[PDB]
Structures are given as structure tokens and as C-alpha cells.
Design a protein around this nucleic acid. Structure first.
Ligand SMILES: [K+]
Ligand SMILES: [Mg+2]
Ligand SMILES: [Mg+2]
Ligand SMILES: [Mg+2]
Ligand SMILES: [Mg+2]
Ligand SMILES: [Mg+2]
Ligand SMILES: [Mg+2]
Ligand SMILES: [Mg+2]
Ligand SMILES: [Mg+2]
Ligand SMILES: [Mg+2]
Lengths: 175, 118, 73, 59, 47, 133
RNA sequence: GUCAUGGAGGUAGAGCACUGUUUGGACUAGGGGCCCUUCUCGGGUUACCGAAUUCAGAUAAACUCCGAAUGCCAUGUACUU
RNA sequence: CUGGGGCGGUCGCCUCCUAAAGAGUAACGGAGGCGCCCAAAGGUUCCCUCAGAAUGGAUGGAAAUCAUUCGCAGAGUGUAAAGGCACAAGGGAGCUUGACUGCGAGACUGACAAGUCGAGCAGGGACGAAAGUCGGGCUUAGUGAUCCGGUGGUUCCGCAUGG
RNA sequence: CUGGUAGUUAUGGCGAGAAGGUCACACCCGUUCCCAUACCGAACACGGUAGUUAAGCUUCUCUGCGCCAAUGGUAGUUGGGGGCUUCCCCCUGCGAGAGUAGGUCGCUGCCGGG
């Protein structure tokens, strides 16, 4: 709401002026942030997943959905079904809240950061923020929780080109 | 990312409904088209491909509603009436691909309350 | 190691286009829908097409690729 | 939004000790501590490690 | 997997044979079936 | 020349009626050896014909084999009666229908091309015509 | 029996849209030869191999985007028998 | 049975090719399956779309789980193959037991014995707002007669009569 | 003119380009209520109309891909004949597939508003 306000106030005009869009409808907006855990160890011990769900619920403030495997793979020792990884899709005000916390509180708790990596865009307009550890997120309390697991954070933009998306993510605050 | 065309996927569902349901000169199809603003009804013959008694929200006759559901009940009331004037009773309800729930339900419930059998 | 085969199942058309059939007459024996149930025709459990009423059989083009059989009184 | 499924979404203020900035953002783990900013609309408080304004790379 | 017979609780006769996997369904199966004697649906239970 | 694998190990002999449906005109070469009558060409015959072409050209110009031995053929040993199922795969043949260009050559002068192709023709069980594009 | 009309059916032929088999060229991700600090991770090298990609060209009882002649089923108020 | 017999192999059922564009069609001809399974993998209502590749991303590798794009089906369909199937016959979820009782015009197949399909009628139901669909499963294997025994039921008979 | 709903083997599809909008139709704004998500008001559902034609939709243009498609010839082939016969030839009737000239950016209803 703090960030979505800033977006509607003094990002849309500035960004529409920068690219010279015909209508305000063309202006890139953030549709959904999708966090993904990817607990492949769960195949052995299911209890490790229960924690990986609970820890993630606190980060998003929105219980995740336990993703089940697609095809059987002997290499990883995996078989059709069986719970592996947890998804959670953030939209609306509660999404901007997370994005704000991500750029304002979260990211500076990593040893360092280069910034908005040009390589880390899919070439369609969407960004994927590689998160090393779970202890970066202030709601987690790593002193209580066992394994670090990790995390995958996808920002799906309405942008057509990385250039447009890059400017949007930048002015929203992302390094 | 691409926005889903709500009417495209709606029309896809409508096909699934029309698979079972088709109008006859004896028992025509009461088809319902719903917009963001207003709602529209047509009692159709598929064998002839001709629209008998029809009614909409924007029609000059009955143009007073509080909610869209209430508006949609007035349409059911009027399309039922216009059907009875034409001399037809037994219809089959074509959801149009809409969930038989809010407005489209309130159209049927209304029409069914008047002289239309389904 | 070979030398096996199942009994032939006598599939195919059992009534001709333009032939008058009594209700219940089997029109086509088939695996799946080579030919679809038209008007006044039913599809049995094994995909057998039968006339639901008395009339004249008509094999018709459905749309481009598919095909149907109807019975018009 | 389903009820009795997710944890609380209740608002909370984040403040870094060094820079001493304040902003509202809904989150879990309140801790129940009063705030100075917008005391009328009272929310919990959370003490935080250096933010972007403080962190040298960012500013 | 085995052949089963469902006995009518009211009628007292078993005019329904079925099959089940007794490893997956070790309990006695209960189905609501039409009893021709009573001319109505009745709870039928495996013997 | 042998197929790396086959769907079926045993195959009907087939027939050789009509003019070849394809490969009647020379495509890649200057000069081609055209089958005048139908026959089976074995892989052993294709190799004998190939080596007798290439040697005379002395690793000069290119040689396209336009037929491939796709079809297996079986045989019963001596002292074996009829029946007891089809025999074991023995070899590989290409049914060459009349009008099919079997070999093409390019990158040598006419005189050398025409000589290399007659040398090859003498290793094949089929009447041949030398044809140029 | 013929004529006319309608129809089911995938053979001959053909074709390569699919599945197998397959030739040549171009392209190109790998791998392997050959030295280098090197963990041969990556270069500078390549017709020793090689999976895609495309251009051209073949091939099939158990391939088919196609598809006859005939034969088959039927209808007629048609002509003969 | 048998390109003499023996030895070996085979014997019933399903799918394909042989099979010559209806059906049928032989060989100790060419290939594979079956002697089950499923309480949902059945019924119905509602909703949905697959394989793979590219690109980006923690543990994470060629390949796990996210995200976007392209994708008529290159997937799937309990299981062989063929014919079907993307209004899905494929995939979810809710409620259920029609995997009903009496039947059945009329057809297919067929030496017989058997086998197959079936609208519709009655009884009483499941799902659905209704239309409607439902007498198992995308379809086609998964079976074995008679005689004799066993078990349950029964407004049948009961060797003078009641049993 | 536009919204709805049908028929018709894509000549109707795909792709590319352009224009249009309070009259619809859209996106769009919101989640109090009915009702929703195996998490998400994304969708579904409900209540709105500040903003916008950007997209869908509508109309127009094009033959790049697809689709449709003659005539002629050829393959094959019923019947009748011949040969030297792994097969081939002649007469009569039928006659592809490929390729090609060409065609196509649809056509035909019914209902509501304008
Ligand atoms: K010779
Ligand atoms: Mg047979
Ligand atoms: Mg069945
Ligand atoms: Mg052929
Ligand atoms: Mg063929
Ligand atoms: Mg002998
Ligand atoms: Mg013998
Ligand atoms: Mg046949
Ligand atoms: Mg006895
Ligand atoms: Mg007595």
C-alpha cells in the first residue's frame, strides 16, 4: 500500500514519459510475486517439508500450496506424486507489502549484493530473484528453525521488454 | 504475461453446455448472455436457427433495478411473460457457460416462477 | 513362436445408405467412432451404431474429417 | 481470502536503530510494541538491522 | 481380490454378488441396493 | 551398407513392377548409372560397384550411392525341409525398379566418368544405361 | 443382368503430413584427438566422432497428408431376363 | 496336428499384418498380448488441458519444484495392439453406488452350443437448478458346458393320511 | 452500425499492418454481502464506473504460411487380346497422387439496441 501508492503517484507518469506510451494501460505493472521453495530432500523425510512450509507461511503471511512431482526420476530417487517443493502466489496489496519488505528490509541482510543483474531476466519481461538463505527474512528467526533450505522469488511483470521491466523494478526501489 | 480473454474461455464452456442442450420448435433453448453492466435473454430454435421471444436489461419496458441480481430477475419476469404471449411453455435453460449461481440463476428462478417449465 | 490370431469380429456397415431400417437395427459395428451417431441413431457400449426409430439410413459428412450416420423417417 | 487457514496479516511498523526511519508494512510476528509515528492508529513495532537508507551500497 | 455376496439386512437374502480387493477393503462392504422382495432400496452388507 | 536397426527382422520379398517412383533423374552428379530393367541389388554388389568406381577416379570428384539396401532376405540351410517357420535373415537388398539412377558421379571429365560407370555396371546384376544431367 | 443414383470400405498407385529405414550438403550445441597456466572448467585448433536444425533427395506387409479401377450394400416410377 | 513318423514346438481367448479398399479367408506364415485389475480406475455435476523445448532462477547435477513464452497433441487413456478420443473417451474436485430389480421392439454374429448390441416400458433410486445422464470401466482379451456335490432362499411336490 | 446467438469441409484458419469507441462490448476499480481459491478476489462470484482503447472485440488492407483448386498429361486398373516373361506390350472404358493455371483475408440466417 506504501509502495502501490508511490507507483500510482510518481512512477506511472515518469515511466510513460520515458518510453512515450500511447495510453496509461501500456504502463508495466507487477501482476504476481510467486515464491517457490523446492524441497527435493522431502522424498526421504516428509517432516523436513512440514518446517519448510511453516517457515515460508511466516515470510509471505499466506499459507503455501505443497507442489507434487510431475514425472518419476530414478536419478533423484523420485516417483509420480510425492510432495516436493511449496509454491505461494502473492497479488494485490499483500504482494506490494512483501516487495517493499524485500527491497527495504530483506536484501541488505545478505553479506553483499551487486544489484538488478541484467542476466537474471527471462527475456520476456519477468524477473527471478535468487535467495541464498532463509535467515535473510526478519520474520524467520533462524535460531529456532533447523535447515536453511533456500528460496526462489519470481516477479511477473506486464512489461514487454527487459528494458521496460528493468526501469519499473528500479524505480520501485530494487537495486 | 498474457491476460486470459474471459469471453473466449466462456464461449469454450458454452460449447460444452450446447453439446447436451439444443432448442426444438416444441421445446426451445432459453439462452443467457451476461455483461459487466447488464444481462440479456433469448428463447431460440436451433432446428430453424431463429430467435423467438427475447428480453434484455436495457429494454424501455422495466428499466428500474436496485442491484444487478434484482435487474436480472426483472429480465426473467419479462422474457417469461413475452414467451407466454408468443404461446410457448416448456424451455431448457442454457447457462451460456456461466456458473448457475448469482445473476444467471436469479434470471432462471424468476422465469421459472412465471409460466415457463424446466 | 507365432501362429496365433483372434476370431474376426465382422465389423463394418450392416445397412446401406438409402435402405429402410426398423428401430434397433445395427447400422455400423466399429472400435471407437470411425462413424458418429447422427440423428435418431444411438452409440452402444461397444461403439455399435443402431437406429433409435424406423426410417431411411443416410451416411453424412460431419465437418471436414469426421462422418456420421442418421435415420430419417 | 480463506479464514482460519493462514497466519495473521496484521500491520506492523519497521524501524532501523541507526537511521531511525519508520514505515508501515503488514507482516507476521508482531511482538506487541508501541509506536511513535501515527500513535492514533496504533500498530506493533519491530527493531531491524540496517535498511537500504542506512546500507552503504544502496545509499 | 475375491468374489463377495451382499446380504440384504431387512430382506435377509443375498441376491447381489460383487468383487473386492480384501487387502485394500478388509472390512465388510456396505452398499445401498434395491431389494426386489421389499421393492425398495435397502442397506446390503458383505457376508 | 546395412540398416542400423529394423522394425521387423523378416519382410516380404515384394514385387518390382513399374518405373521407379523416384530417383529417375540425376540430382547431385554430372553422370549417373540408370537401371534399364528391374532387379534386387545386394549390399555386396553395391560395395563391389562403389570400390570399382572410386578406385578408377583415384579419390577424385564425388560418388553418390542413390540406392540403399533396406529390405532383409532370409534362407533355409541345406538338408532342411519346408515349414517350421521363416528362415534366418541372410542379407540386405535394394529392389531397383527400371529407370532408377543407382550411382551418380561428378568432379571428373566425361571420359573418366563414362569409364568408371562401365566398370561399376559390370559388378551389377542389372542392364544399365549411362545418363548425364 | 444392365442403366441411373446414393453409400461404406484405405488395396493399386502415389506421397512423406506422422512412425520406422536412409543419402548428400550447409549449420551447430556437445564429446574426442593436440599443447598451455589447467581441476583439459574455457580458449587458439579442428571434415577423429556427434544430437538437434534446416535445404535437397530416397524408402515401407505390419508408414499415410492422399487415393483409384474393380468388387460390395442399397434405391428406382428404368429396360431386359 | 505334423511337407513321412519320432524328437522339438503347438492346442482356448484378444490385437495387428498376411487379407487382393464390404464381410470372410490358409500355412509348423510375420509380430505381440490374456487366464486380470479398479470401492474408484464405476455413476453424475462442475471445472480443466497435455508432451517437449527455449530463457531466468538457492539447495540442484543433462533431468526434481517455480515463472514466462512457443507448442493439434509430438502426451495421456490400469494393461498388447488396432480403431478412437483435446464439445475430450485425457486431468482435477463435490456428492454418490445404475458395478440397479423385472424386462425388452428390433438387429448383428452364427452349423449348433454359445456370443454381441439394443431404443423403449415398469419398479425404486444417484447426481443435477433443470435439460438430462447412469443396467460398470474409450472400445475389443481376463474364461469352461453337462452330470454330480455344497450353501442360502422358496405362496411347488410330499407314494394311504398328517408330517 | 454494433451486441447476442446459429448454420456452413479453413475459400471461413494463422501471421503481418492500420483505424475505431460511453452506444454497446471490453479491460478496468473494489471485496461489504451471495459465492470463490488444494495458497492467491488471478480465476469464479458479487458491487461499482475514476481511468483506457493498450489488449480482446469490431471494421479495413495483404497471399508470407496454411487451406481450396481446374484443364492436360502420367501411374494404376475393369473387360478383351498378345509376348521373350524378376516381368512387359496392345485395344476399349474408368482414372489418380504429385505438380500446375487459378481461388481465398469468407459466405448465409434470426433477435436486441443505434
Ligand atoms: K551388368
Ligand atoms: Mg483369421
Ligand atoms: Mg462395457
Ligand atoms: Mg505400393
Ligand atoms: Mg501401404
Ligand atoms: Mg516332404
Ligand atoms: Mg517331417
Ligand atoms: Mg477386407
Ligand atoms: Mg441335489
Ligand atoms: Mg405321505
Amino acid at each position: 500500500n506504501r509502495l502501490k501508492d508511490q507507483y500510482l503517484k510518481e512512477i506511472v507518469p515518469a515511466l510513460m514519459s520515458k518510453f512515450n506510451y500511447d495510453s496509461v494501460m501500456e504502463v508495466p505493472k507487477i501482476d504476481k510475486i510467486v515464491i517457490n521453495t523446492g524441497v527435493g530432500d522431502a522424498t526421504a523425510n516428509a517432516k523436513v517439508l512440514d518446517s519448510a512450509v511453516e517457515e515460508l507461511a511466516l515470510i509471505t503471511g499466506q499459507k503455501p500450496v505443497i507442489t507434487k512431482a510431475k514425472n518419476s526420476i530414478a536419478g533423484f530417487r523420485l516417483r509420480e506424486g510425492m510432495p516436493i517443493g511449496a509454491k505461494v502466489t502473492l497479488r494485490g496489496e499483500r504482494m506490494y507489502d512483501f516487495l517493499d519488505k524485500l527491497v527495504t528490509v530483506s536484501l541488505p541482510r545478505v553479506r553483499d549484493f551487486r544489484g538488478v543483474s541484467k542476466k537474471a531476466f527471462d527475456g520476456r519481461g519477468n524477473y527471478t530473484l535468487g535467495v541464498r538463505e532463509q535467515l535473510i527474512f526478519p520474520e524467520i528467526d533462524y535460531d529456532q528453525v533447523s535447515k536453511v533450505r533456500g528460496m526462489d522469488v519470481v516477479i511477473v511483470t506486464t512489461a514487454k521488454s527487459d528494458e521496460e521491466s528493468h526501469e519499473l523494478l528500479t524505480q520501485l526501489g530494487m537495486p | 504475461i498474457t491476460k486470459i480473454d474471459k469471453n473466449k474461455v466462456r464461449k469454450k464452456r458454452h460449447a460444452r453446455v450446447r453439446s447436451k442442450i439444443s432448442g426444438t420448435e416444441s421445446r426451445p433453448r432459453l439462452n443467457v448472455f451476461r455483461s459487466n453492466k447488464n444481462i440479456y435473454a433469448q428463447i431460440i430454435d436451433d432446428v430453424n436457427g431463429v430467435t423467438l421471444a427475447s428480453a434484455s436489461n436495457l429494454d424501455k419496458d422495466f428499466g428500474s433495478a436496485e442491484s444487478k441480481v434484482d435487474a436480472a430477475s426483472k429480465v426473467g419476469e419479462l422474457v417469461a411473460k413475452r414467451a407466454s404471449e408468443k404461446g410457448i411453455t416448456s424451455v431448457t435453460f442454457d447457462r451460456g457457460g456461466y456458473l448457475y449461481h448469482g445473476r444467471v440463476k436469479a434470471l432462471a428462478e424468476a422465469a421459472r416462477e412465471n409460466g415457463l417449465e424446466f | 513362436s507365432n501362429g496365433r490370431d483372434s476370431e474376426s469380429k465382422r465389423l463394418g456397415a450392416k445397412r446401406a445408405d438409402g435402405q429402410f431400417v426398423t428401430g434397433g437395427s445395427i447400422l455400423y459395428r466399429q472400435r471407437g467412432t470411425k462413424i458418429y451417431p447422427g440423428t435418431n441413431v444411438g452409440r452402444g457400449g461397444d461403439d455399435t451404431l443402431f437406429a433409435k426409430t424406423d426410417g431411411v439410413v443416410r451416411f453424412e459428412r460431419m465437418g471436414r474429417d469426421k462422418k456420421k450416420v442418421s435415420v430419417y423417417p | 481470502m480463506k479464514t482460519g487457514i493462514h497466519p495473521e496479516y496484521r500491520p506492523v511498523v519497521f524501524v532501523d536503530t541507526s537511521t531511525d526511519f519508520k514505515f508501515l508494512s503488514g507482516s507476521t510476528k508482531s511482538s506487541s510494541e508501541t509506536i511513535k509515528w501515527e500513535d492514533g492508529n496504533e500498530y506493533p513495532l519491530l527493531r531491524v538491522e540496517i535498511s537500504s537508507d542506512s546500507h552503504p551500497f544502496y545509499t | 481380490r475375491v468374489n463377495i455376496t451382499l446380504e440384504c439386512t431387512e430382506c435377509g437374502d443375498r441376491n447381489y454378488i460383487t468383487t473386492k480387493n480384501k487387502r485394500e477393503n478388509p472390512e465388510r462392504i456396505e452398499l445401498k441396493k434395491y431389494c426386489p422382495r421389499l421393492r425398495r432400496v435397502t442397506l446390503h452388507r458383505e457376508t | 551398407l546395412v540398416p542400423k536397426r529394423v522394425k521387423y527382422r523378416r519382410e516380404f520379398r515384394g514385387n518390382m513392377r513399374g518405373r521407379a517412383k523416384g530417383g529417375t533423374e540425376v540430382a547431385f552428379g554430372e553422370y549417373g548409372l540408370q537401371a534399364v530393367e528391374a532387379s534386387w541389388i545386394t549390399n555386396r554388389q553395391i560395395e563391389a560397384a562403389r570400390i570399382a568406381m572410386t578406385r578408377y577416379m583415384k579419390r577424385g570428384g564425388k560418388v553418390w550411392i542413390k540406392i540403399f539396401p533396406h529390405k532383409s532376405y532370409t534362407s533355409k540351410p541345406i538338408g532342411v525341409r519346408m515349414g517350421k517357420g521363416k528362415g534366418a535373415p541372410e542379407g540386405w537388398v535394394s529392389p531397383v525398379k527400371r529407370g532408377k539412377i543407382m550411382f551418380e558421379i561428378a568432379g571428373v571429365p566425361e571420359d573418366v566418368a563414362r569409364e568408371a560407370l562401365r566398370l561399376a555396371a559390370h559388378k551389377l546384376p542389372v542392364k544399365t544405361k549411362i545418363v548425364k544431367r
